[PDB]
Amino acid sequence: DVMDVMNRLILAMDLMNRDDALRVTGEVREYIDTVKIGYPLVLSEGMDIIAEFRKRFGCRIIADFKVADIPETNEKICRATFKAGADAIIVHGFPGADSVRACLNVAEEMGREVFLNTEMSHPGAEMFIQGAADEIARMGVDLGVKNYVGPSTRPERLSRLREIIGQDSFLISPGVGAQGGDPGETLRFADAIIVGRSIYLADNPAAAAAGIIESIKDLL
Amino acid sequence: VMDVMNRLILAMDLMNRDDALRVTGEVREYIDTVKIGYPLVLSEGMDIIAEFRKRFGCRIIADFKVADIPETNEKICRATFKAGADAIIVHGFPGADSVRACLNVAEEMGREVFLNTEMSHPGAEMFIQGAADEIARMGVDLGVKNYVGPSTRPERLSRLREIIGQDSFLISPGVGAQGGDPGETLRFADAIIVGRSIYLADNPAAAAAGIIESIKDLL
Numbered sequence A: 001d002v003m004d005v006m007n008r009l010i011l012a013m014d015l016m017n018r019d020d021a022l023r024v025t026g027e028v029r030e031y032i033d034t035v036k037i038g039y040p041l042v043l044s045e046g047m048d049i050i051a052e053f054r055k056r057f058g059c060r061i062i063a064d065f066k067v068a069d070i071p072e073t074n075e076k077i078c079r080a081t082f083k084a085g086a087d088a089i090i091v092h093g094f095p096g097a098d099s100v101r102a103c104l105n106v107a108e109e110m111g112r113e114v115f116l117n118t119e120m121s122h123p124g125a126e127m128f129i130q131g132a133a134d135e136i137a138r139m140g141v142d143l144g145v146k147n148y149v150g151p152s153t154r155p156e157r158l159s160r161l162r163e164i165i166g167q168d169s170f171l172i173s174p175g176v177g178a179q180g181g182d183p184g185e186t187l188r189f190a191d192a193i194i195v196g197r198s199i200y201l202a203d204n205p206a207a208a209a210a211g212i213i214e215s216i217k218d219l220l
Numbered sequence B: 001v002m003d004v005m006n007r008l009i010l011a012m013d014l015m016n017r018d019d020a021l022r023v024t025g026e027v028r029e030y031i032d033t034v035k036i037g038y039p040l041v042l043s044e045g046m047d048i049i050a051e052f053r054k055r056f057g058c059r060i061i062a063d064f065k066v067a068d069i070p071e072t073n074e075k076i077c078r079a080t081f082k083a084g085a086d087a088i089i090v091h092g093f094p095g096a097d098s099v100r101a102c103l104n105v106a107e108e109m110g111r112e113v114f115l116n117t118e119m120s121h122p123g124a125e126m127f128i129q130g131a132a133d134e135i136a137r138m139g140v141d142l143g144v145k146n147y148v149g150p151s152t153r154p155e156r157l158s159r160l161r162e163i164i165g166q167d168s169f170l171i172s173p174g175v176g177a178q179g180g181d182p183g184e185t186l187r188f189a190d191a192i193i194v195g196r197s198i199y200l201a202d203n204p205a206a207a208a209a210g211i212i213e214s215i216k217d218l219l
């Protein structure tokens, strides 16, 4: 019983202008039904943008807020985020189990999902995150987390994450395209890929999305 | 370093504009520095920063625990400074590139970065504590001048002060509701952050005045 992402492709909509964000999302709407919205767009245009996306596209919204505070603050962040209409929120595991549990509680209260970020995809992740990543994944399993995020840029690490969480858990993966990750290789392990700049900075975002999907058509 | 009145920073985590403004107004004679985080910002919008600047003579620290990849961190910092925040708080666990991205924007934009080195809640023991000394040392190497460390662990706060040196600026949450003591915390931190002990009080002004009275010899 997991999220069903059209074409295994999640748009990372990190444009910071409302008109551009709506236009570009509109251009690729035939290809997706899931949009990841983060702080670049929300802090520039307000949390009301989430409801607007739902009104215009009916798409699922994952709030990529990298939640990383103490439990009582995490609870408030999740509540405000779900009140705005997000279907799911992404939370860091590095701050520990109590901080993750706070998010799980609010998600269960409001009919939403928590995604646990286990290993980030950028070079700096090697310094502290990578050494904790397997343990963070096991912590997710212990807590009953069913949704995870891991790195397209390190398919061996993404594979290990998939091993830890099992085939039943849901796994999404950013770092495809601009950061160097490959769509098809990433989908060997992840249920869905997250793609931002490769699509939203493209001269023709629709063609960019279509091209990515063409490259993975055998993977559905 | 920023000159924090009474060594006391209000953590304004009420989620309703009217309540947040009322409480902040009530304690304005005691503070000139307010920490605004996502509970309030996600409820009322980034224009809440503008509103606080208009209503109060307060510096604004945006406690956004910035914790993304460098390119996204840059965007978050730009949006936050554009809205009028004096400073932003960032995490170090995502690594040096992620911190450097924030520092670069702050330098370009004439604002400040605070690095959170060790959080004050129990879960911090699992992963954060073991990385904290290195995160602090990384901050020093990167040129970070402003830091956050935990009131709830005096021994850890003392070690973090040692690492960053006496010239760095250190603020510390976990005072009051989380169990930290104002006076003991100020042995090491330049200023204490206080939220619920003030903002949930029947009389927030009396609560702030009481905390200040308890540390008067340190002012």
Ligand SMILES: O=c1cnn([C@@H]2O[C@H](COP(=O)(O)O)[C@@H](O)[C@H]2O)c(=O)[nH]1
Pocket: A012, A014, A038, A064, A119, A120, A121, A122, A149, A151, A174, A175, A176, A177, A178, A179, A194, A195, A196, A197, A198, B068, B069, B072
């Ligand atoms: O470990 C990571 C790496 N990137 N991202 C996010 O995924 C998107 C990647 O976008 P991109 O395709 O433009 O690189 C951005 O929103 C970035 O913050 C994560 O959530 N986790």
Ligand SMILES: O=c1cnn([C@@H]2O[C@H](COP(=O)(O)O)[C@@H](O)[C@H]2O)c(=O)[nH]1
Pocket: A069, A070, A073, B011, B013, B037, B063, B116, B118, B119, B120, B121, B148, B149, B150, B173, B174, B175, B176, B177, B178, B193, B194, B195, B196, B197
């Ligand atoms: O390690 C920590 C612990 N708490 N906080 C923040 O400081 C405030 C503590 O508020 P309190 O006095 O109500 O506990 C809240 O905004 C919390 O998110 C931090 O930034 N870092």
